Design a protein around this ligand. Structure first.
Ligand SMILES: *[C@@H]1O[C@H](CO)[C@@H](O[C@@H]2O[C@H](CO)[C@@H](O[C@@H]3O[C@H](CO[C@H]4O[C@H](CO)[C@@H](O)[C@H](O[C@H]5O[C@H](CO)[C@@H](O)[C@H](O)[C@@H]5O)[C@@H]4O)[C@@H](O)[C@H](O[C@H]4O[C@H](CO)[C@@H](O)[C@H](O)[C@@H]4O[C@H]4O[C@H](CO)[C@@H](O)[C@H](O)[C@@H]4O)[C@@H]3O)[C@H](O)[C@H]2NC(C)=O)[C@H](O)[C@H]1NC(C)=O
Ligand SMILES: *[C@@H]1O[C@H](CO)[C@@H](O[C@@H]2O[C@H](CO)[C@@H](O[C@@H]3O[C@H](CO)[C@@H](O)[C@H](O)[C@@H]3O)[C@H](O)[C@H]2NC(C)=O)[C@H](O)[C@H]1NC(C)=O
Ligand SMILES: *[C@@H]1O[C@H](CO)[C@@H](O[C@@H]2O[C@H](CO)[C@@H](O)[C@H](O)[C@H]2NC(C)=O)[C@H](O)[C@H]1NC(C)=O
Ligand SMILES: *[C@@H]1O[C@H](CO)[C@@H](O[C@@H]2O[C@H](CO)[C@@H](O)[C@H](O)[C@H]2NC(C)=O)[C@H](O)[C@H]1NC(C)=O
Ligand SMILES: *[C@@H]1O[C@H](CO)[C@@H](O[C@@H]2O[C@H](CO)[C@@H](O)[C@H](O)[C@H]2NC(C)=O)[C@H](O)[C@H]1NC(C)=O
Ligand SMILES: *[C@@H]1O[C@H](CO)[C@@H](O[C@@H]2O[C@H](CO)[C@@H](O)[C@H](O)[C@H]2NC(C)=O)[C@H](O)[C@H]1NC(C)=O
Ligand SMILES: *[C@@H]1O[C@H](CO)[C@@H](O)[C@H](O)[C@H]1NC(C)=O
Ligand SMILES: [Ca+2]
Ligand SMILES: [Ca+2]
Ligand SMILES: [Ca+2]
Ligand SMILES: [Ca+2]
Ligand SMILES: [Ca+2]
Ligand SMILES: [Cl-]
Ligand SMILES: [Mg+2]
Ligand SMILES: [Mg+2]
Ligand code: NA
Lengths: 1084, 668
């Protein structure tokens, strides 16, 4: 309600797409993006920073790489104030790889104390074609020193011209002797590859060029030598073109090289080019076309000019597995489509990742970027646009990442991710209800009570369609413990806008009404035929967002030129230097900076002198119109500011208009103001903060008809705060929900006897019918039978006042005027806070009724008990009784009663499905034993966390003969626990008689082993899993004289019965048992 | 019946108080001490006190029908509405044998539809045959679509733009959003030759811009060539659809304007506008009375089925992967459309609440529904909807239309208010006030049944005895002034607070509180002296409960599984089954132990439950294949261990049991 709609700042820039994205920055600027602005040749998107003092916008200069084509820079923005930083991204970067067009993204990280850097730090790579390149160099006697030296310098040059591991090399020098200086395998393992060339020495000798090629083709291109099957095979022969001594010719070796798909370059040395014999030799060696594959040894750029090659990628378009096409990975990733700052580094959403299954990259400072997404197993995540929106959540100290996926199953959903070990894994999910609603298009973490931990996540579904209205925001509170994440409530805009796109943009503004509860702002840019609007929603205790908005601001309300008002939002910082937070709202071609106004609260106290009208004042000894009686009225106003961080002069001037009314709504007012000679008076004053009091003289007629009902004085006021000159006439305003009507009562003395002042004794007492104790969580209401009595003179306006802790609250129940008497009593009540803090008082006032002598009244007062009540182990309810006439009191008759309190919890232990059902053993296996397992699981199905102890009872002996050997209790899942053992001897009886009744070995007749596992905190919806594992012997069964017997273990839950009570009726489920059946057989 | 006494000074004030309130106009029906408040009460307590049956004034809601089209009758109704009292009339729907039908076929040309597009020759004749079989006089026409031609939807590389297909095929076509190929025509050979003429196209991502094409078809009735007859739009595709919001990936933020953009039978500005919203498309379709038929592959059926909830008049049919079964699809889809009839109404004020009772030939009856719904509607077999219209106020001159969805035929309803009496003498009332409807209505300042007093004056004693409820009460409850024997209640200036009653003992703000407001606020109900009188469509002590059961049922309409009954849109689940819809019970004991006899019965035909069987195991259905339930293993009648599984189904203790044929004995 305190968003200023009159004094306002509006930024206008001609640039295309201006206002499409906004963000507050460094408590100084509004940074605005203009994604469609053409800033340069094949470059789109521009940034602007907008100041409040200047009221104008200046562009932000950035060195944009030539590799970044049409980024749509400023399409998404983000900022943080930990250190002040800005993040501006262009997610539509067009990258041309071959004849494919890629769509990646580029972001810029800005800050005052840092130099501007980019994310991702590296340019996007094109798919490079693998190529296995073999050098075959002539080291014959015809090659001479420098010529050979030049040949090696050629090799050094070429190797440096190719990237790894796209290209890798192999070198064999030939003469009449062959030497492979390094193979593809050796090259692949090399740290510095150019170190291998330092050792190469010439072999002299003859020149077996043809045979060398055959050797290379047969050997060096094999996988055993480190060659790759998919790599292009290239052979570079460096020779002086004179082959002497070889028993083979090129006609013999080259056809095999061609069948192997080996591209061959002939690099000429010395006189190789001029001589006819040598030139033909180079032609035979080289591939076709020949002149394109023949070069001088001096030309080091020969190969590079021909290839720095890319492998063309054939896309599996429209989900087609066929056509031998590769699938989308990070080609269309669009990094930076969304962005958020997290303590461990900035996070950039990548919507197009892996067939638009999405995800987001975390970029930790000075570390390798990690990729956050759904597991590969989730095929349904395809075309879900995960990472369309990105938000940071803090469950406590834990850093959680929320990603929206508005296209998931055409309905949309949001997913939370946290780090386990060094691995990012999904924690929770929540799904939209209506198809096309774009659930998860926008996200907003809200810390309602400002403890540093996210209580709640707002999820936008902008295109949700009802016939009357459009757009929806889900309130999804972060789940406690192992509880599932679900949306508690939903928020709507006003009706009449079926395509209003309510929830298109979300932001946290902070606490604006000073209730210490964080407030939010939701944009609806489609309302009123795309003029747009903005909603302010208050925060609510027991963290939820208020169902109804506190203020709505239409674009039309502000300007006739406004379009898409609220398409982008950003608040929480103070940009107007007044100390109060300000909101930045985006629109088409415009950005508006709205400020919040300081909020005031006014308290009222009214009292009379004298407090009660003396009986002397009213008595008709005639002269019927006679001397009036005077009563003094003291009215005190108290004005404190609700906005605590307001900078400036301590005092806030404010114009207050008072309206006073004596006996309002009455035919004959029983008093008049001496000033106006009527029952109405008005004051207009200008008050500073805190207290101000004034006196008014009242005139009571000499005689009046009604001397029973007390004279009432009604005060109501309006408040217009004087404009603060220092902050462009910022005006303090009264809270919207503030009480404006105040009423004081002036009682008459009552006439009992003759000149006898009335005296009433009043006693109160109440019991709790039905219950001796209160089980919080199981008792949602508390009924008190309250009896009041008056043994004396009549009491008028008898009131009964209850006092109780916060968990309790009075509830008016209505069932009356049935056949018979439900007509008896009428009550009027209201609930208000009392004390330092923590206690409450409900005062019920009995009117219509003259409470006469001896007569007593009883009624049923019903209180609601919150299932989350913080009562403790004892609940104290007090009841004070009083009347219109303020007796000296302190005569007690103020009743109080304390009540025993326990807390409802629901715990269950059960036998798991997977255990040892039976063991079969032959008559000759008395010596043997076999492993047997009993599994139990414990669940908390209640609404409360509690410490528990799980006990296990395992029979291990029968008459000092082993039954279950080496029983060990294990809990592989959730293991940080304890388990103590206590041997227990069984109460002695005839075991044969016991077995005869039913073939069962339990802890009654057998030596048992008692395990105790304490759980410090058993969370809600938490599941514990225990296993009793040991060796079950067959020998002891011999004593029993039954062919088959049952061995039974028992599990039992225990907790503090003084503090807790198992959910009534479910006590039986705190105990469970499992049975292994031993069965004997003969052959058949 | 029942009457709240709110304002009793007048007859109209009495009628407005409640629908059960009636008025007595007999002069001197009041005793010398009796007030005028007893003139206004229910019929059982009025005649009983001696009031005549003829002069009792009780307006009643009335529906006038003038029937003197064919399908939808009556074609005009005029309602006479009393506040709180419902008026009811019947609307009759008779399905005609045949209508003229315009069939527009939206064809997917993306590369994924390659094999469906190899059947284009057959497709021409098939589509023609389908239309001829459902219509005597029909027109046909079609258009083609792929997707928006920007990234990431389409590879915008110059080479890929002229040949988007991943393989090297000569017969390919550059990507395009939407192309209107042929206007709706009666020319059969023109349709066949133009359909077969079409070539395959392609793009990058799987979902296509079909919603774009459908929006353009619905927004351009001129270029498409619709008649004022039944309009059918067949949408055929193998994959999903882009909708509003997706355009942001191509830096497209401007909403679809729902306007026609066709240049040379093309959507040229498609890269300038975002895809339409689903609700945006649904509205434009209903506005132009277009019933879309979604011919989608099996993979996509469950998805497009979700659309029919947002788009009431639409149908989904499973399309063969080669688009060969298109005829059988269209006929079944058309029949599905026609066999279901919805009866709805346009915009209403807050003061008009309309509900329908559906009486079907189906053998199913719906009552108190926000919309008329009848499935299995047969030809020439008339169905009758009962329309109940209630006003919460004395209303102005208004008119709304009731319409069968999918048809231009309407029912016009004129709404006239019925608040007055028409009952069912001067100088009587001994002064100023003029006599009206059995009593004098005094002028300003003067008050009394015979106007024998004035507020400002003597106001003597002994008449203040009737201003007290009982001897222990304060005169006029202390909330009013005693004048001429009766009570004139005080006027409190508070939002919504009014004091009323003979002794001023009643007010409007003292009732049960829902949310934070009294009686759930003006939306749910109003408060009258302790009790909350709820508005139509609401009920409860605090008007806290809502009538609809839509919140209790699952999408399959199961109504809280079979393990809970619905109250106030909250499933009240017995046993230990949890909220909302009572599907699962986490803390239940294991059912395994007691079904071992039944397991032995079904699978092995033995034990105590042989020939016993079907009678002894009512809730068990046997599956010879493994099920997805909970594991069990117990000992049967002869001691062997029988393994079986229980998959729970909707209802009270009904499971789907799978039993293993291999038992476990110590033999073995
Ligand atoms: C969320 O993000 C994750 C990434 O963080 C995505 O998961 C990735 O998905 C991609 C593609 O689907 C996988 O790439 C493929 O990897 C194959 C080799 O795997 C090995 O190397 C990778 C290198 O990182 C390792 O991660 C793998 O780890 C393995 O072990 C873990 C742990 O147990 C397992 O969970 C994994 O499943 C792995 O088993 C392995 O060590 C590789 O064969 C494959 O190459 C083909 O596909 C690409 C195109 O994508 C072509 O360029 C390439 O040439 C191959 O394609 C040709 O050959 C095939 C052969 O049949 C033909 O069919 C083609 O038509 C073509 O001719 C590819 O490179 C990646 O491994 C995987 N990573 C993880 C960690 O799972 C998730 O998908 C994503 N979520 C969703 C919902 O999508
Ligand atoms: C990056 O964005 C810019 C700005 O939109 C692109 O510039 C545009 O380039 C295209 C090239 O195809 C031009 O289209 C041409 O238009 C004429 C007539 O409109 C047509 O006859 C040609 O055949 C051609 O299609 C377009 O006019 C031009 N726009 C402007 C404003 O200059 C640029 O192409 C984008 N870069 C990439 C790699 O996509
Ligand atoms: C005190 O309350 C009275 C009663 O509501 C206010 O007077 C009303 O003002 C509204 C508009 O603000 C009018 O519609 C009403 O007709 C007025 N009532 C009467 C009885 O005249 C008055 O403005 C309030 N005063 C202050 C200072 O707030
Ligand atoms: C506990 O029982 C297991 C059987 O579950 C025993 O393991 C067997 O040991 C015998 C040796 O006497 C081997 O011949 C079997 O092959 C083993 N079985 C399996 C499944 O490994 C084990 O010896 C028993 N432990 C004790 C202490 O007796
Ligand atoms: C509208 O049609 C329905 C048809 O069911 C009428 O309801 C029937 O009323 C008759 C007597 O009038 C009863 O015998 C039937 O049992 C009723 N049918 C049902 C299903 O309850 C209804 O009265 C008609 N309304 C008008 C105004 O004509
Ligand atoms: C199926 O038949 C069996 C027996 O043939 C019935 O089970 C008997 O139930 C009675 C109940 O009083 C017991 O006293 C018997 O002992 C049971 N018989 C056995 C063999 O245990 C069973 O009720 C029949 N079920 C149906 C549906 O008819
Ligand atoms: C007793 O009740 C009176 C109500 O008049 C209240 O003002 C007072 O604070 C109460 N005292 C206690 C201890 O609650
Ligand atoms: Ca918090
Ligand atoms: Ca707040
Ligand atoms: Ca500010
Ligand atoms: Ca597509
Ligand atoms: Ca197909
Ligand atoms: Cl040589
Ligand atoms: Mg040589
Ligand atoms: Mg397709
Ligand atoms: Na992709």
């Amino acid at each position: 309600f305190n968003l200023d709609t009159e004094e306002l700042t509006a930024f206008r820039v001609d640039s295309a797409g201006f206002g499409d994205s906004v963000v507050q920055y460094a408590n100084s600027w509004v940074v605005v993006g203009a994604p469609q602005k053409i800033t340069a040749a094949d470059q789109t998107g521009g940034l602007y920073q907008c100041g409040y003092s200047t009221g104008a916008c200046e562009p932000i200069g950035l060195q944009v790489p030539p590799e970044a084509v049409n980024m749509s820079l400023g399409l998404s923005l983000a900022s943080t104030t930990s250190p002040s930083q800005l993040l501006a991204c262009g997610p539509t970067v067009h990258h041309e790889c071959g004849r494919n067009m890629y769509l990646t993204g580029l972001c810029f990280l800005l800050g005052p104390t840092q130099l501007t850097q980019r994310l991702p730090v590296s340019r996007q790579e094109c798919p490079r074609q693998e190529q296995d390149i073999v050098f075959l160099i002539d080291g014959s006697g015809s090659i001479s020193s420098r010529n050979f030296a030049t040949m090696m310098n050629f090799v050094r040059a070429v190797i440096s011209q190719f990237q790894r591991p796209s290209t890798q090399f192999s070198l064999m020098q030939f003469s009449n002797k062959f030497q492979t200086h390094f193979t593809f395998e050796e090259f692949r393992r090399s740290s510095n590859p150019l170190s291998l060339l330092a050792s190469v020495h010439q072999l002299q000798g003859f020149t077996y060029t043809a045979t060398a090629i055959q050797n290379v083709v047969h050997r060096l291109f094999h996988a055993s030598y480190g060659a790759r099957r998919d790599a292009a095979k290239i052979l570079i022969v460096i020779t002086d073109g004179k082959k002497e001594g070889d028993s083979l010719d090129y006609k013999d070796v080259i056809p095999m090289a061609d069948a192997a798909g080996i591209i061959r370059y002939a690099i000429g040395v010395g006189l190789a080019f001029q001589n006819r014999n040598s030139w033909k030799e180079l032609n035979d060696i080289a591939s076709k076309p020949s002149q394109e594959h023949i070069f001088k040894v001096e030309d080091f750029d020969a190969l590079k000019d021909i290839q720095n090659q890319l492998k063309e990628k054939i896309f599996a378009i429209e989900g087609t597995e066929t056509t031998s096409s590769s699938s989308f990975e990070l080609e269309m990733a669009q990094e930076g489509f969304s962005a958020v700052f997290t303590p461990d580094g900035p996070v950039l959403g990548a919507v197009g990742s892996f067939t638009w299954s999405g995800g987001a990259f975390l970029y930790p400072p000075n570390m390798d970027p990690t990729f956050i997404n759904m597991s590969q197993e989730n095929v349904d995540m395809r075309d879900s646009y995960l990472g369309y929106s990105t938000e940071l959540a803090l469950w406590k100290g834990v850093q959680s990442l929320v990603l929206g996926a508005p296209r998931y199953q055409h309905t949309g959903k949001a997913v939370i991710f946290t780090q386990v070990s060094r691995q990012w894994r999904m924690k929770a999910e929540v799904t939209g209800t209506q198809i096309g609603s774009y659930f998860g298009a926008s996200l907003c973490s809200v810390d309602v009570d400002s403890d540093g931990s996210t209580d709640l996540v707002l999820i936008g579904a902008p295109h949700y369609y009802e016939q009357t209205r459009g757009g929806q925001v889900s309130v999804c509170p972060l789940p406690r413990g192992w509880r599932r994440w679900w949306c508690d409530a939903v928020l709507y805009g006003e009706q009449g806008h079926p395509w209003g796109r309510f929830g298109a943009a979300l932001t946290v503004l902070g606490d604006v009404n000073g209730d210490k509860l964080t407030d939010v702002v939701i944009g609806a840019p489609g309302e009123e035929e795309n003029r747009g609007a903005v909603y302010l929603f208050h925060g609510v205790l027991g963290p939820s967002i208020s169902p109804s908005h506190s203020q709505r601001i239409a674009g039309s309300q502000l300007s006739s030129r406004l379009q898409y008002f609220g398409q982008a939002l950003s608040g929480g910082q103070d940009l107007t230097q007044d100390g109060l937070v300000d909101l930045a709202v985006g629109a088409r071609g415009q950005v508006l900076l709205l400020r919040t106004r300081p909020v005031l609260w006014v308290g009222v106290s009214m009292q009379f002198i004298p407090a009660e009208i003396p009986r002397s004042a009213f008595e008709c000894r005639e002269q019927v119109v006679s001397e009036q009686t005077l009563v003094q009225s003291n009215i005190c106003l108290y004005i404190d500011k609700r906005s605590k961080n307001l900078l400036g002069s301590r005092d806030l001037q404010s114009s207050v208009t008072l309206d006073l009314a004596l006996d309002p709504g009455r035919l004959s007012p029983r008093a008049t103001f001496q000033e106006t000679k009527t029952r109405s008076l008005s004051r207009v004053r200008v008050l500073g903060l805190k207290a101000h009091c004034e006196n008014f003289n009242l005139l009571l007629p000499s005689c009046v008809e009604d001397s029973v009902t007390p004279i009432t004085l009604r005060l109501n006021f309006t408040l217009v705060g004087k404009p603060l000159l220092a902050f462009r006439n910022l005006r303090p305003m009264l809270a919207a929900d503030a009480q404006r009507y105040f009423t004081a009562s002036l009682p008459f003395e009552k006439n009992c006897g003759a000149d006898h002042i009335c005296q009433d004794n009043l006693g109160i007492s109440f019991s709790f019918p039905g219950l001796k104790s209160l089980l919080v969580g199981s008792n949602l209401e508390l009924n008190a039978e309250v009896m009041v009595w008056n043994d004396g003179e009549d009491s008028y306006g008898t009131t009964i006042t209850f006092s109780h802790p916060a968990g309790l609250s009075y509830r008016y129940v209505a069932e009356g005027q049935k056949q018979g008497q439900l007509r008896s009593l009428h009550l009027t009540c209201d609930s208000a806070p009392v004390g330092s803090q923590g206690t409450w008082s409900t005062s019920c006032r009995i009117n219509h009724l003259i409470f006469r002598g001896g007569a007593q009244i009883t009624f049923l007062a019903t209180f609601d008990v919150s299932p989350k009540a913080v009562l403790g182990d004892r609940l104290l309810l007090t009841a004070n009784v009083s009347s219109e006439s303020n007796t000296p009191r302190t005569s007690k008759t103020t009743f109080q009663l304390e009540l025993p309190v326990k807390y409802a919890v629901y715990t269950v232990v059960s036998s798991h499905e997977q255990f040892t059902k039976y063991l079969c053993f032959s008559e000759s296996e008395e010596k043997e034993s076999h492993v047997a397992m009993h599994r139990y699981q414990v669940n908390n199905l209640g609404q409360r966390d509690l410490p528990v102890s799980i006990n296990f009872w395992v029979p291990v002996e029968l008459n000092q003969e082993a039954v279950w050997m080496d029983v060990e209790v294990s809990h592989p899942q959730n293991p940080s626990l304890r388990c103590s053992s206590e041997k227990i001897a069984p109460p002695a009886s005839d075991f044969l008689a016991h077995i005869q009744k039913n073939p069962v070995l339990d802890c009654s007749i057998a030596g048992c082993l008692r395990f105790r596992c304490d759980v410090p905190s058993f969370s809600v919806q938490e599941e514990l899993d225990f296993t009793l594992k040991g060796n079950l012997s067959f020998g002891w069964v011999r004593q029993i004289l039954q062919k088959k017997v049952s061995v039974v273990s028992v599990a039992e839950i225990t907790f503090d019965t003084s503090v807790y009570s198992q959910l009534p009726g479910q006590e039986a489920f705190m105990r469970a048992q499992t049975t292994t059946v031993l069965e004997k057989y003969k052959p058949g | 019946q029942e009457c709240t006494k709110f304002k009793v000074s007048s007859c109209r004030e009495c009628i407005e108080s409640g629908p059960g309130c009636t008025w007595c106009q007999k002069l001197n029906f009041t005793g010398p001490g009796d007030p005028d408040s007893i003139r206004c009460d229910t019929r059982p307590q009025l005649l009983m006190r001696g009031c005549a049956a003829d002069d009792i004034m009780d307006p009643t809601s009335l529906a006038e029908t003038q029937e003197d089209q064919k399908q939808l009758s009556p074609q005009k109704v005029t309602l006479y509405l009393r506040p709180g009292q419902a008026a009811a009339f019947n609307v009759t729907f008779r399905r005609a044998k045949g209508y003229p039908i315009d069939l527009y076929y939206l064809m997917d040309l993306s590369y994924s539809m390659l094999d469906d597009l190899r059947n284009v020759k057959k497709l021409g004749g098939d589509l023609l045959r389908a239309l001829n079989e459902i219509t005597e006089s029909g027109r046909i026409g079609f258009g083609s679509f792929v997707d928006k031609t920007v990234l990431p939807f389409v590879n915008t590389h110059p080479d890929k733009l002229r040949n988007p297909c991943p393989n090297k095929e000569k017969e390919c076509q550059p990507p395009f959003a939407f192309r209107h190929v042929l206007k709706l025509t009666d020319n059969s050979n023109q349709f066949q030759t133009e359909v077969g003429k079409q070539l395959i196209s392609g793009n990058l991502d799987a979902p296509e811009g079909g919603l774009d094409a459908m929006m353009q078809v619905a927004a351009c009735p001129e270029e498409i060539g619709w008649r004022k007859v039944t309009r059918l739009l067949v949408f055929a595709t193998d994959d999903g659809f882009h909708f509003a919001g997706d355009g942001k990936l191509g830096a497209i933020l401007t909403p679809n304007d729902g306007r026609c953009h066709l240049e040379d039978n093309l959507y040229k500005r498609s890269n300038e506008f975002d895809y339409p919203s689903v609700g945006q498309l649904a509205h434009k379709l209903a506005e132009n009375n277009i019933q879309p038929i979604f011919a989608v592959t099996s993979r996509m059926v469950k998805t497009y089925e979700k659309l029919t909830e947002i788009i009431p008049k639409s149908a989904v049919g499973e399309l063969s992967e080669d688009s060969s079964n298109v005829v059988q699809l269209i006929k079944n889809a058309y029949n599905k459309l026609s066999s279901r009839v919805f009866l709805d109404h346009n915009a209403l004020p807050d003061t008009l609440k309309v509900t329908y009772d559906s009486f079907c030939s189906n053998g199913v009856t719906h009552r108190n529904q926000p919309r008329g719904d009848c499935d299995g509607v047969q030809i020439n077999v008339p169905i009758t909807f009962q329309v109940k219209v209630t006003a919460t106020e004395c209303i102005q001159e208004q008119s709304f239309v009731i319409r069968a969805l999918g048809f231009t035929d309407i029912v016009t309803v004129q709404v006239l208010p019925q608040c007055e009496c028409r009952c069912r003498d001067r100088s009587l009332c001994h002064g100023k006030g003029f006599l009206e409807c059995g009593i004098c209505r005094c002028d300003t300042g003067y008050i009394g049944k015979n106007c024998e007093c004035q507020t400002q004056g003597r106001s003597s004693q002994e008449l203040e005895g009737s201003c007290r409820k009982d001897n222990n009460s304060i005169i006029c409850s202390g909330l009013g002034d005693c004048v001429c024997g009766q009570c004139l209640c005080h006027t409190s200036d508070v939002p919504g607070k009014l004091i009323y009653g003979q002794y001023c003992e009643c007010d409007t703000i003292n009732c049960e509180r829902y949310n934070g407001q009294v009686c759930g606020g003006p939306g749910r109900g109003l408060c009258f002296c302790g009790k909350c009188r709820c508005h139509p469509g609401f009920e409860g002590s605090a008007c806290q409960c809502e009538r609809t059961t839509e919140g209790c049922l699952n999408p399959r309409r199961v109504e809280c599984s079979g393990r809970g009954r619905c109250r106030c849109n909250v499933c009240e689940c017995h046993s230990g089954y949890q909220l909302p819809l009572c599907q699962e019970c986490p803390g239940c004991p294991s059912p395994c132990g007691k079904y071992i006899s039944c397991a032995e019965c079904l699978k092995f035909e033995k034990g105590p439950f042989g020939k016993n069987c079907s009678a002894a195991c009512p809730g068990l259905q046997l599956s010879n294949n493994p099920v997805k339930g909970r594991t069990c293993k117990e000992r049967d009648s002869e001691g062997c261990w029988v393994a079986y599984t229980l998959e729970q189904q909707d209802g009270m203790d009904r499971y789907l049991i799978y039993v293993d044929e291999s038992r476990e004995c110590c033999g073995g």
